[PDB]
Amino acid sequence: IYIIGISVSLWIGLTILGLFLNKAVFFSLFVPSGTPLPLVPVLVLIELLSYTARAISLGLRLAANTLSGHLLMSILGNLVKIFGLIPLAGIFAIVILEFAIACIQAYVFAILTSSYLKDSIY
Amino acid sequence: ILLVTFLGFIALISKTVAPLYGEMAKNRTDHVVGLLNQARADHVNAVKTRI
Amino acid sequence: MQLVLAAKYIGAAIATIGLTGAGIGIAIVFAALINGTSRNPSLRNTLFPFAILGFALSEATGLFCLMISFLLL
Amino acid sequence: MQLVLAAKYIGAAIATIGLTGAGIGIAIVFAALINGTSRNPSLRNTLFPFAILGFALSEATGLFCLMISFLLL
Amino acid sequence: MQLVLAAKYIGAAIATIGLTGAGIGIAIVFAALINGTSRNPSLRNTLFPFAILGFALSEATGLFCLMISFLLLY
Amino acid sequence: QLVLAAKYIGAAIATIGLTGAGIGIAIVFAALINGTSRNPSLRNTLFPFAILGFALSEATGLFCLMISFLLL
Amino acid sequence: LVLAAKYIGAAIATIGLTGAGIGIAIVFAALINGTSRNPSLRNTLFPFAILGFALSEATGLFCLMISFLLLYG
């Protein structure tokens, strides 16, 4: 699941960069705020470079959720050796936060794609 | 954690069942009330035009 | 051999230093949303969509930094 | 295995540096909720739901960083 | 022993670096409660219950980090 | 031996820059959530500066991650 | 051995990214909060944000060239 998540996220990042480059062949380009200054081409850490960082951050949700569930093996040996009822409440809160993180990660990926489509048509 | 997740999701699905039926009343049940009000207004307009 | 195995345990310790920015970032967005909701009337939607989307962007640094320490251990 | 045994004890100590961000996050979310409730009248629900959900997101960094130091012992 | 014994003493000192977040957390919750109580009249309960419950959550990070340094020295 | 053991240390201390990139996304979101409740910067206006400001603040984390990934 | 110390120069030099990452958000927080007070929209505050961000990002570009030069020359 970890290797399939990084491979699926890399294909979505290449499609976002290819769609923005195809629209620049008939609607100018620029994409730079000018305010009586220069050195705007050196800070090209967005658009093309931003797709690589957004794909690794969105694809890491599958690996982070598996790390929380795999951490119960270290707490299972100590609870079967204070009362052990504190581990049940902590595992229930981490499972609810991991399931709710999938909806927040899906909304963050759709919000990032809306900025690329709106800037390519302006 | 498997038994705690099944018990917590059972209580959340029970409260969501009442919320889904109540939220559907403003769209599904509201369509029947809107169609009945439109049919009553069309019947009064047809009776006034026939008179 | 022996030097490469000892560096794997220390590589996962210093890489977890980024949890201070990701942990405090989840509370910085929640502090402004709780204090701003009582000022009327950013409750339903409007500011609710930016709080859910802003929390996932701030927490992305902790998930990316955790993959480096997990790959070296 | 002399170098790997000494690195396991040092790896669990430097990995606990992330508790500063998780510990201060529980107080940052509680400071805005206590000062915002006195403005009338964010008490029942409204701001009470965001404080409980916001504290769980900030505490996730402390629980995730503690599993790294516990697995190396 | 030798290498493992020297790493146990140094591990109890580096693990105590997390006390800065737990120590400053008790003052951050007390500063908002003292400044907010002057607006009249959050005294009994209300603000006193959130300050007592909020201080226990911030102190959980320091108590959990102290058990790691204490287990390596004993 | 010495070059292989130094590769693990080259990716551990290099990830310390995530504190600036992680807290930067929350600093721009705190001013945007508190400013939107003052009426009525919703569509565009303040939304364009918050979307463009979040990508510039996240550029530091992408450059620091490429250094740790190249040595590991 | 010079190859062992060359890898450490590219990791400890990245500690300066905290000032460049937080500086881009500090200038954006004052510009977003000041534009909602009517009516610093066209130019004025928008033109100073592009020039002000280049001064804060100059420290991160100079510090990144030091660690990149040790890994190649």
Side-chain angles (χ1 to χ4, degrees), chain A residues 5 13 18 24 32 34 36 38 41 53 55 59 63-64 69 77 84 87 89-90 93 100 102 106 110, chain B residues 8 11 18-19 22 25 34 39 41 46, chain C residues 6-7 11-13 15 18 21-23 25 27 31-32 36 41 49 51 54 56 60 62 68, chain D residues 6-7 11-13 15 18 21-23 25 27 31-32 36 41 49 51 54 56 60 62 68, chain E residues 6-7 11-13 15 18 21-23 25 27 31-32 36 41 49 51 54 56 60 62 68, chain F residues 5-6 10-12 14 17 20-22 24 26 30-31 35 40 48 50 53 55 59 61 67, chain G residues 4-5 9-11 13 16 19-21 23 25 29-30 34 39 47 49 52 54 58 60 66 73:
Chain C
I68 298 169
Chain D
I68 298 169
Chain E
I68 298 169
Chain F
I67 299 169
Chain G
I66 298 169

